Amino acid sequence: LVHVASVEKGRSYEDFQKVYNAIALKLREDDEYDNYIGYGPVLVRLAWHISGTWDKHDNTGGSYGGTYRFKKEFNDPSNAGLQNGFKFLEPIHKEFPWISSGDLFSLGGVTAVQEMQGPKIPWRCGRVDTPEDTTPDNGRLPDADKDAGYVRTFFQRLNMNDREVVALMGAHALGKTHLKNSGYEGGGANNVFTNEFYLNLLNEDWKLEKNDANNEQWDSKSGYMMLPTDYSLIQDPKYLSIVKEYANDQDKFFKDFSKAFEKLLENGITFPKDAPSPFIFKTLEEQGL
Numbered sequence: 001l002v003h004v005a006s007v008e009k010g011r012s013y014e015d016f017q018k019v020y021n022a023i024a025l026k027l028r029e030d031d032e033y034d035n036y037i038g039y040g041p042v043l044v045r046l047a048w049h050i051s052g053t054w055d056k057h058d059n060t061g062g063s064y065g066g067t068y069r070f071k072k073e074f075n076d077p078s079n080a081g082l083q084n085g086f087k088f089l090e091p092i093h094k095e096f097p098w099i100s101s102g103d104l105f106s107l108g109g110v111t112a113v114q115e116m117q118g119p120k121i122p123w124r125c126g127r128v129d130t131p132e133d134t135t136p137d138n139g140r141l142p143d144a145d146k147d148a149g150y151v152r153t154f155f156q157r158l159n160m161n162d163r164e165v166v167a168l169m170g171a172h173a174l175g176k177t178h179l180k181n182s183g184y185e186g187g188g189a190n191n192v193f194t195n196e197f198y199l200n201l202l203n204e205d206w207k208l209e210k211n212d213a214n215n216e217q218w219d220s221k222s223g224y225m226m227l228p229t230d231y232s233l234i235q236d237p238k239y240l241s242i243v244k245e246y247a248n249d250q251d252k253f254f255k256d257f258s259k260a261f262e263k264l265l266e267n268g269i270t271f272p273k274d275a276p277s278p279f280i281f282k283t284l285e286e287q288g289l
């Protein structure tokens with residue numbers, strides 16, 4: 001099972017920069033969503049969920065095939081709330097229907113990270129839409145009620161090591177949980193990409209509580225929350241060391257997140273040796289737009 005990247009016919013950097021710019025301008029425009037968080041966090045989560053179905057053992061799932069567009073995946077209980085992201089991207093796809101679905105979903109996440117002042121994330125084109133029978137079954141995305149051993153084992157399936165796991169989880173600086181989507185009660189929310197997930201873990205006064213959906217979560221006096229799987233990163237001594245590193249080095253976190261997030265979004269894709277190099281998109285800010 002090989003998925004070879006195939007550039008959309010006749011497209012180059014500038015075509016994709018136009019798609020980035022459309023996403024970015026819409027992110028700026030549509031600011032009221034989710035109590036003024038805007039769509040950045042949900043677009044990051046969408047890019048992660050379409051990629052996180054991957055299985056290194058048989059190369060099933062992953063971002064390549066764009067299979068989130070099919071009902072089995074769109075309706076995965078793990079994906080509840082991502083329809084908001086899909087709906088955001090709908091007009092973008094109508095404007096630029098030459099782009100593949102997996103390229104659009106993944107590019108939405110890159111764009112969101114960068115427009116939220118995160119690191120640059122190099123991005124490669126060429127995902128090709130595959131048929132409905134290539135859609136992975138539900139149940140490949142992670143549970144939140146578990147411990148560090150579960151997190152470590154889960155992420156081995158995605159070929160991610162300790163450092164890559166802790167880096168990726170820093171995206172939980174962004175946005176919030178919603179009781180109706182996941183059974184977790186959100187606290188204070190943010191739409192700027194920083195290392196604050198790690199600083200919150202280490203600095204806040206946490207108390208384990210049971211929410212109104214009967215699930216356990218860690219709540220701070222200041223109004224923040226952590227999932228059990230978030231909090232696991234300070235319970236396990238290997239994860240804790242890395243949490244401390246990132247809480248103490250913003251640039252290191254940015255560089256490691258960038259690498260891990262590109263790798264997540266590329267897992268399962270074979271890039272020909274003569275494929276274009278990764279693209280690094282300019283932000284709206286860098287373009288004076």
Ligand code: HEM
Pocket residue numbers: 041042044045048080081142143144145151168169171172174175176177178179181182183184227229261
């Ligand atoms: C053990 C791994 C993980 C678990 C169990 C987990 C679980 C969750 C849950 C329960 C939510 C709330 C969904 C809702 O109620 O709307 C959430 C939101 C989020 N997740 Fe994760 N997640 C994990 C890893 C990641 C990774 C690797 C990323 C990206 C790099 C990510 C990015 C996000 C973002 C940005 C949101 C906020 C969405 C919003 O504000 O609408 N998550 N995740």
Ligand SMILES: Nc1ncnc2ccccc12
Pocket residue numbers: 172173174175176177188189190225226227230
């Ligand atoms: N803002 C968040 N803080 C801690 N953990 C999270 C987990 C999922 C989404 C958002 C957060």
